[PDB]
Amino acid sequence: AIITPALISALKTSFQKHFQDALATAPSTYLQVATVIPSTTASNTYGWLG
Amino acid sequence: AIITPALISALKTSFQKHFQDALATAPSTYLQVATVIPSTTASNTYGWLG
């Protein structure tokens, strides 16, 4: 006649991490639509002739 | 002879430590009425069989 706190609830229970980091995020797709340009200062300026 | 107050007031004297630890009351008087139990845990559960 063990008291409920020390029962299947807590005393008899094993922790498992099968659900961890299983639901993923949508795959990255920004490369297909955008291109990467590096920078090394506060801003970047672009110019073309015509 | 004929020493100014600063030289007399200056620390020609040695500094001891017999003052410290004089009133150091002996701890651990609670062991007579209490037992020390390590936790290593947020909480502890104590349940005995009858």
Side-chain angles (χ1 to χ4, degrees), chain A residues 3-4 19 30 42-43 48-49:
Chain A
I3 58 162
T4 302
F19 293 100
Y30 77 105
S43 77
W48 57 105
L49 174 48

Side-chain angles (χ1 to χ4, degrees), chain B:
Chain B
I2 318 305
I3 312 301
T4 64
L7 277 296
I8 301 299
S9 287
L11 184 72
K12 307 193 147 62
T13 64
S14 55
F15 191 80
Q16 282 84 29
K17 319 282 164 90
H18 301 82
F19 41 76
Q20 200 76 62
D21 307 340
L23 296 185
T25 65
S28 178
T29 186
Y30 74 106
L31 298 180
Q32 308 185 241
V33 294
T35 177
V36 177
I37 294 166
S39 180
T40 66
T41 309
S43 174
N44 296 115
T45 313
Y46 302 115
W48 60 101
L49 187 74

